Amino acid sequence: TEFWLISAPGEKTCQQTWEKLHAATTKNNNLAVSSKFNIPDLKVGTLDVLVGLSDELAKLDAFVEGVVKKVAQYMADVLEDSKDKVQENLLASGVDLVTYITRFQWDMAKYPIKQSLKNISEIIAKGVTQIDNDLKSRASAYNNLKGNLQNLERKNAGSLLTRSLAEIVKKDDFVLDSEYLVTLLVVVPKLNHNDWIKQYETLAEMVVPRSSNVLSEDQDSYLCNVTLFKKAVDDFRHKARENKFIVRDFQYNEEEMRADKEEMNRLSTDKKKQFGPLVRWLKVNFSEAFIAWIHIKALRVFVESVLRYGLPVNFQAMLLQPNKKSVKKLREVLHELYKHLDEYYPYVYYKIDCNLLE
Amino acid sequence: SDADVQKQIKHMMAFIEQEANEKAEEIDAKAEEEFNIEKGRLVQTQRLKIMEYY
C-alpha cells in the first residue's frame, strides 16, 4: 500500500487549499483517501542548510528505508512459525502502519523544534546508524545459531546410513575392552536382510554364529552390530562391501553420543534465548526506524516547501492514499489544483510504501 | 515566465532578510558568550595578580 505526502500554500489561510483539494479529490470519484498530515514549524535557516538538507535527507531516506525493510525481513526470519501474524507484530505505537502514518505526530521530545534542521537530521542519522549497528550484531549472532542448528539437523537427517549413531547405540549390544575381540557396525538394505542374517557368519574366518545384533531399522535398511575375533575384521569388511553391504563403525563412542546430545539440548535452548529478545528488539528497532523514516519524509516535505516558497512558509501538509484504478485521474486533479505553483509536479510530492515485509 | 520570476524575486528578497537576521542572531549569541568569557578571564587574571601582591 502506497501513500503520498504533499504540500502547497494557502492563498491567505491553509484551509483554502485544503478545502479545494479535499472536496475535489473526494467529490469527483474515490481518487484517494484524503487527510491532513502533521508537520510542525521548525526553526528555518539559510539556503546552505536547506539545500544541503534537501539532498542529504534523500540519502538518509534511501538508508532508513533499507534499514526498516531489513528489520521487517529479520522479523520474518526470526518468526519461523506464525508467519500470518507478521503484520500484527510489525506495529508502530501499538497500531498498524497505515494508522500510524495517518495519525502521525512529530516527536518534539526527541526532536525539539528550536533546533536547526541539520541537528535534527544528525540525531536521526546517529539513531538509525546505531539501529543498523545493533541489527548487524543481532543478525550475525542469529544467522550463526540458525546455521549451527542446521548442521546438527543434517547430522540427524535421513536413513540409518546418514543419521548419527548417537540416537540408537547402547552398551549392551557391544563386545569391547578386549585383546582378541572386536565389534563392527553394518547397514544393509531391507530386501537383503533375510540373506545377511546367515551370510555374515561366512564373510570371514573366525566369526561366531549369531554375531549380529540390530540397533534399529527404517523404510530402507537395518543397522546391526557384529561381534568377531580381531583377525576376521578386514576380510569381513571387504567381503561385506563385495556383497554390497556398507560398514559404518561406531564402537559405543560415549564422547560422540554425549556431544550430539549436549549440543541438541544447548542449541534448542539457545534458539529460544535468541528468539524472544530478537522479536522484542526487532519490534523496538522497527518502530524507531519506521518513526525516523517518516520524520525524514516530513523533513523532505518541510525543507522543499521552505525552498519552493521562501522562509515565511504557509504550506498545509496533506496525505493521499491513491486508488490503483484512478491514480492517473488523481495526478490530473492534483496538477489542475496546483498548476499555478510553477516524474515532476508543480506542488511538493513524496511517497511512502507499507510493503516492507513483501 | 514573468510572474514566476516576480514571485522568485520576492522570495529571494525574503531569504536575505531572515539570513541577515540569522547572521545577526549568531553574532549576538556569540557576543553574549564572549561577554561572560572575557569578563571571567579578566576578573580572575587580575584578581590573581592582585592576590600575588597581597
Add this chain to the structure above:
Amino acid sequence: RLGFVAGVINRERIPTFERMLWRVCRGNVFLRQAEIENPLEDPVTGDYVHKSVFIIFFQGDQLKNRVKKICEGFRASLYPC
C-alpha cells in the same frame, strides 16, 4: 551575502537550461538571458551561431555548485566577472 555566475550558450538550449535550474534548485533561482547583437563563430566548426548571454543569482556555496553543475551539463561557457 549573495552570489552569482555569468556566461553564454546557444539560444536553443535556454528552455531546458532554465527548467533544469528550477528543478535542481527547489524552485529558487534568479535568471536573466540576453541576446547578442550578432551571431558568433564556433572556434571548431566555424558556424556563426545566435548565442545569448546569461546571468544567474543565488545565495550561498551550495547553490553555487548546483548552478555551475547545470552550466557544465549544458556545456554553457562560464566566465569570471
